Amino acid sequence: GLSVLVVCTGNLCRSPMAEIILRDKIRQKRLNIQVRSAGTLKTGKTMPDDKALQALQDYGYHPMVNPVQQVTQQDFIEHDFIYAMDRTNLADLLDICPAEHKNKLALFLSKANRQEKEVPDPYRRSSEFFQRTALLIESGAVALVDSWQE
Amino acid sequence: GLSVLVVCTGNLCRSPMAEIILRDKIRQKRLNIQVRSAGTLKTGKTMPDDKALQALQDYGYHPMVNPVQQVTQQDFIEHDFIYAMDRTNLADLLDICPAEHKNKLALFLSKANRQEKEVPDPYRRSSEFFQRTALLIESGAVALVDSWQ
């Protein structure tokens, strides 16, 4: 059958989510297409992010998940199409994709008739908000320390 | 000396961040104040969240960290002040604080002269964003399935 690979930076959130969702919709439509996911960067992790998996459960998907893996050279040959979650992902694959297979590269959102062209990284968004929390807590802490000396 | 407790739901993010930041500011002025943190809800976890700690490092704090712990009744007697990061925390504390000690309870931001009176939960925001991330991915997936068939 057909072979599809989905790729984000760490294979921790976005691309594993797409794999699980694609697999399900493929099985609903009884298509003979298999799907995997991979990251551009070697992470130390074994399994995808728990918060990715819980969001899939909230929407009725069963997250039975493959181990995290980084993209390889054989992936560009063995797979029929390969989808990138954001432009940075698409660039790094093109950076290392031999010219014979570069037409197989595309952004994940390319067939959805929507304004959004990249799916943004939830992890960077997460970090931004934790950094924002720190600043608010810092402001609170300074006031408490003042009040205490009074 | 003075003893201060700061409290969130899981003792994973807001309250340990506050403990570490408070400890730094107390030691900067060599005040005789101790600070600890605790959660209203018993989770199984041992240490706070990695991204709470990294966010502290990003701002130059050195996160030396106590194990996660749940608030106890001894906490309401042993501590001089007890701060809830948000109203949900303050409500859960009022539920189990003996009436003799409820005057020790206050919102963490009660002395910051700001609009914000609650520190919003980064975990709930994060969860919201993963859900909207999934929906964007799902709509993408549906389109991909169509073009193939």
Using the Cβ of A35 and the Cβ atoms of chain B, whether some distance falls under 8 Å is answered with: no
Q: Which of B112, B104, B136, B99 is nearest to A107 (CA)?
A: B136
Residue A132, Cα to own-chain centre: how many angstroms?
Answer: 23
| Best CA proximity match to B127, nearest among A147, A66, A5, A126 | A126
Q: Helix or strand or coil: residue A62?
A: coil
- Under CATH, what is the fold of the domain B2-148? Rossmann fold (3.40.50)
A54–B140 CB contact, under 8 Å: no
Helix (H) or strand (E) holding A8: strand A2-8
Amino acid letter for position A146: D
Cβ of residue A33 closer than 8 Å to a chain B Cβ: yes
- Which positions in chain B touch A122 (Cβ < 8 Å)? 126, 129-130, 133
- Best to test chain B binding among A57, A136, A150 (most B CBs inside 10 Å): A136
Burial of A134 (0-12, 13-18, 19+ CB in 10 A): buried
Please enumerate in sequence order all residues whose Cβ is within 8 A of that of B24, keeping only pairs 6 or more positions apart, or say none. Answer: B61, B62
CA distance B29 to A2: 66
Domain boundary assignment for chain B: 2-148
Q: What is the CATH number that goes with domain A2-149?
A: 3.40.50.2300
Separation between Cα atoms, residue A17 and residue A52, nearest integer Å: 7
- Cα distance between residue A59 and residue B127, in whole Å: 13
Question: The sheet that has A33-39: what strands, in order across it?
Answer: A33-39, A2-8, A81-84, A105-107
Give me the residue from B21, B33, B136 closest to A138, CB to CB.
B21
Record: contact B129-A126, CB cut-off 8 A: yes
Q: Residue B8: which of B79, B92, B104, B95 has the closest Cα?
A: B92
Using the Cβ of B43 and the Cβ atoms of chain A, whether some distance falls under 8 Å is answered with no
Q: Which of A26, A127, A134 sits opposite B17 (nearest CB)?
A: A134
Say which amino acid occupies A80: D
3-class secondary structure, B5: strand
Active site includes A8?
Answer: yes
Select the residue of B122, B131, B147 nearest A133 (Cβ to Cβ): B122
State which H helix or E strand residue B51 sits in: helix B50-58
Helices (H), chain A: 14-28, 50-58, 73-78, 87-96, 122-148
